[PDB]
Ligand binder design. Sequence first.
Ligand SMILES: *[C@@H]1O[C@H](CO[C@H]2O[C@@H](C)[C@@H](O)[C@@H](O)[C@@H]2O)[C@@H](O[C@@H]2O[C@H](CO)[C@@H](O[C@@H]3O[C@H](CO[C@H]4O[C@H](CO)[C@@H](O)[C@H](O)[C@@H]4O[C@@H]4O[C@H](CO)[C@@H](O[C@@H]5O[C@H](CO)[C@H](O)[C@H](O)[C@H]5O)[C@H](O)[C@H]4NC(C)=O)[C@@H](O)[C@H](O[C@H]4O[C@H](CO)[C@@H](O)[C@H](O)[C@@H]4O)[C@@H]3O)[C@H](O)[C@H]2NC(C)=O)[C@H](O)[C@H]1NC(C)=O
Ligand SMILES: *[C@@H]1O[C@H](CO[C@H]2O[C@@H](C)[C@@H](O)[C@@H](O)[C@@H]2O)[C@@H](O[C@@H]2O[C@H](CO)[C@@H](O[C@@H]3O[C@H](CO[C@H]4O[C@H](CO)[C@@H](O)[C@H](O)[C@@H]4O[C@@H]4O[C@H](CO)[C@@H](O[C@@H]5O[C@H](CO)[C@H](O)[C@H](O)[C@H]5O)[C@H](O)[C@H]4NC(C)=O)[C@@H](O)[C@H](O[C@H]4O[C@H](CO)[C@@H](O)[C@H](O)[C@@H]4O)[C@@H]3O)[C@H](O)[C@H]2NC(C)=O)[C@H](O)[C@H]1NC(C)=O
Lengths: 210, 209, 13
Amino acid sequence: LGGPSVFLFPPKPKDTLEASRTPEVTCVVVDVSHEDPEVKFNWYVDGVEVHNAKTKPREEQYNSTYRVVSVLTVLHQDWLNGKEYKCKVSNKALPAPIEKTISKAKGQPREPQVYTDPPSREEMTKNQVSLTCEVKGFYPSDIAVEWESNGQPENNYKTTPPVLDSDGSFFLYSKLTVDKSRWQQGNVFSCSVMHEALHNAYTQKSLSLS
Amino acid sequence: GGPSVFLFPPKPKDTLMISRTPEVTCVVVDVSHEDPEVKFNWYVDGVEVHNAKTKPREEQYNSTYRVVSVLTVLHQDWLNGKEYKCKVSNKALPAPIEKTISKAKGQPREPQVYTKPPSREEMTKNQVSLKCLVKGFYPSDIAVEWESNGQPENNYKTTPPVLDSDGSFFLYSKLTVDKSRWQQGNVFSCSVMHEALHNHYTQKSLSLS
Amino acid sequence: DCAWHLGELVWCT
Ligand SMILES: *[C@@H]1O[C@H](CO[C@H]2O[C@@H](C)[C@@H](O)[C@@H](O)[C@@H]2O)[C@@H](O[C@@H]2O[C@H](CO)[C@@H](O[C@@H]3O[C@H](CO[C@H]4O[C@H](CO)[C@@H](O)[C@H](O)[C@@H]4O[C@@H]4O[C@H](CO)[C@@H](O[C@@H]5O[C@H](CO)[C@H](O)[C@H](O)[C@H]5O)[C@H](O)[C@H]4NC(C)=O)[C@@H](O)[C@H](O[C@H]4O[C@H](CO)[C@@H](O)[C@H](O)[C@@H]4O)[C@@H]3O)[C@H](O)[C@H]2NC(C)=O)[C@H](O)[C@H]1NC(C)=O
Ligand SMILES: *[C@@H]1O[C@H](CO[C@H]2O[C@@H](C)[C@@H](O)[C@@H](O)[C@@H]2O)[C@@H](O[C@@H]2O[C@H](CO)[C@@H](O[C@@H]3O[C@H](CO[C@H]4O[C@H](CO)[C@@H](O)[C@H](O)[C@@H]4O[C@@H]4O[C@H](CO)[C@@H](O[C@@H]5O[C@H](CO)[C@H](O)[C@H](O)[C@H]5O)[C@H](O)[C@H]4NC(C)=O)[C@@H](O)[C@H](O[C@H]4O[C@H](CO)[C@@H](O)[C@H](O)[C@@H]4O)[C@@H]3O)[C@H](O)[C@H]2NC(C)=O)[C@H](O)[C@H]1NC(C)=O
């Protein structure tokens, strides 16, 4: 052991994009020795120290190290306005306190273009068909894509990670796989996208058998 | 502090194209100046081979050497699933390091390739995107390229392969072209190379109404 | 038959 390490994690995209949710910044300290498990946390928001953070229960990793985690609640506006969140970690095993800083990716926010594609005619021979949701030209890369149908979530889908495009924006694809019969019945399927650059941080695109 | 070994596979195109030569690369970093000598032992399915070649030794300017050994493999040896073991011996090493790689195990599955036109909503923009859906393939080793009129189209981006729920992989490739080129009826083609394809190759074309 | 890619031979069966 050469000393504990620190990893500072951002809040979930959906947590920052929905008013119902409460976004959190997480400062994780690993490789905390048993001899000196005492960890001091100092939180800062744009250089100003705050005192409303809470420490999660200590966890034994069973490799002779503890896992110490401090969680700081952030405001939706504060995160979206690009406030800096600094986590300072002090411990006897550290020659000097470790400081890590995270915030929203900086840069002009860009609105996602959402397009959908129906299955090919060749796909009408298979047991299941693929529906495509194309989300492109958005920034930052923080986003959440979901599917639904008749006010009910469709879960049989996969989404590619965001890919850096040539124009500096991001794009991704989400593929929903449904039974053929469901598709040939004329049922409407919806692709829902959540991103800060959308109006009310939300848009929904639909398609059906045409 | 001691040396570490990284064994790399051949490039998918090199194994898929008969007009190319696939090779496995055994990379050794953190090689000290005091003991730069590195012994290589190569094995194919446990049987030792001797046709390997050592790349030029390199200074990493952090007071370490980078010793690399390269072994040419046969196209079908790699496609059949032969394992390649690289054994690295060094005197700054308590015991010789052995690394083994091969093609990802599992029955090869043929990729389904479907092309999608740009939305009519996208016709109001300066450029349009052509989509190539490649799904249901295994292993993830694949090459996806675009072309038009016998010439390659390089203005594209392709997502990494994504593990599907049925155990196979899928991906999307997006070629962006000037809208005028699409309106003039030019045909664009999505090329896919994969071991499970007939002649390791397929091509799907797409153009305006 | 064989398959070609921009002039370069891919594979033949
Ligand atoms: C002793 O064990 C320790 C842990 O137990 C391990 O035990 C073994 C038996 C195995 O089972 C092993 O899998 C166990 O982890 C071990 O600690 C590990 O130390 C590693 C480095 O020494 C460290 O690797 C780093 O990981 C970073 C990212 O980690 C995330 O993902 C990993 C898995 O991929 C996951 O294990 C971590 O927990 C992290 O996951 C994130 O967790 C956060 C916080 O909870 C989530 O965010 C919040 O989530 C909540 C809701 O849950 C809210 O949403 C809130 O709003 C959010 O803020 C987040 O979602 C979650 N994600 C995932 C994926 O789960 C890498 O980024 C990092 O790489 C970076 O850093 C390296 C340098 O270190 C650079 O080189 C890289 O370039 C890069 O910058 C690095 O890889 C492990 O994460 C850590 N494991 C744990 C559990 O803490 C310790 O080392 C062991 N010690 C010894 C001596 O053996
Ligand atoms: C001293 O410096 C050394 C390197 O110089 C570094 O010098 C610095 C000053 C900087 O200039 C820095 O940029 C230089 O890298 C440094 O050595 C490094 O050591 C690292 C770990 O100790 C090691 O990281 C690992 O990397 C593995 C993958 O390696 C590839 O990708 C890395 C990242 O970019 C790259 O650095 C390497 O060069 C490798 O790049 C690829 O190499 C393959 C061949 O192996 C190429 O494919 C072949 O391609 C040829 C054609 O070119 C043929 O086609 C052939 O058939 C193919 O096989 C490929 O083209 C090439 N890609 C590109 C784009 O270049 C990771 O896999 C590995 O991660 C594993 O291990 C970690 C643990 O370490 C696990 O946690 C992971 O889960 C995973 O299992 C790891 O990250 C660096 O690669 C290595 N750097 C180099 C250049 O070798 C050394 O440590 C320094 N010493 C000190 C500081 O004391």
